[PDB]
């Protein structure tokens, strides 16, 4: 559980093992603090939501394509909590017409 | 950026050139935290909220005026940070209504 989180931190950020520290302290703390689930085991609301997202991104074609790949996941029978990865993707969606804040040396501000 | 935020603190208080260190330390903390703003980029969406706000304080003539000013603003310079300035101003707006209490006795409590 921990080992998993460490591997997420170290890998993406690269090996400081003391400069990936921040994320790791952050990670254990955030998951351990319990809350009761919201958007869970209601996959019908989630599919609809991603289709609206596509409609918004001016990609109507990608919404029918997505629906086809979605049904392909069901038959495999693996990945217990499908909704959680879908939920993640949607949060980080962005439209092809802007780009969100990128800056570095943010500590100085 | 260190210089710019320190000068920001000194200017607003109208004085204190190394006595605003404490306020500064706070400001460095807030900025170092992260946000997810509801509505991220895209010039149309912010202009629409500003007009509604103008109507609400009963300054109609100002809403119409601003829209010309927005097209003008663009023409004078084009950013990818245009939206962040317009949203910044939006949040930082002041209502004409009510007295803003006393500060001449509110300091003491």
């Amino acid at each position: 559980p921990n080992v998993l989180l460490q591997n997420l931190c170290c890998r993406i950020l690269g090996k400081g093992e003391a400069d990936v520290a921040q994320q790791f302290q952050y990670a254990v703390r955030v998951i351990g603090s319990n809350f009761a689930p919201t958007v869970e085991r209601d996959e019908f609301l989630v599919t609809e939501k991603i289709k609206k997202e596509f409609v918004r991104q001016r990609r109507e074609a990608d919404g029918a394509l997505f629906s086809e790949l979605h049904r392909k996941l069901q038959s495999q029978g693996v990945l217990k909590n499908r909704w959680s990865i879908l939920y993640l993707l949607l949060s980080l969606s962005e439209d092809p017409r802007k780009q969100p804040n990128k800056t570095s040396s943010f500590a100085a501000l | 950026p260190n210089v710019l935020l320190q000068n920001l603190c000194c200017r607003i208080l109208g004085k204190g050139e190394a006595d605003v260190a404490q306020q500064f330390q706070y400001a460095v903390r807030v900025i170092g935290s992260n946000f997810a703003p509801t509505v991220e980029r895209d010039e149309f969406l912010v202009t629409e909220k500003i007009k509604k706000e103008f109507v609400r304080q009963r300054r109609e003539a100002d809403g119409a005026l601003f829209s010309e000013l927005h097209r003008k603003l663009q023409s004078q310079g084009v950013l990818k940070n245009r939206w962040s300035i317009l949203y910044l101003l939006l949040s930082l707006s002041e209502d004409p209504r009510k007295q803003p209490n006393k500060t001449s006795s509110f300091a003491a409590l």
Partner: peptide, 24 residues
């Protein structure tokens, strides 16, 4: 009854956008 469903369906759409907003 169709006329009720129509209003129902609209309302659902506005609450979904708010749910995700309130979640953010």
């Amino acid at each position: 009854a169709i006329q009720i469903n129509f209003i129902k369906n609209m309302i659902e759409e506005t609450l979904d956008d708010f749910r995700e907003a309130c979640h953010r």
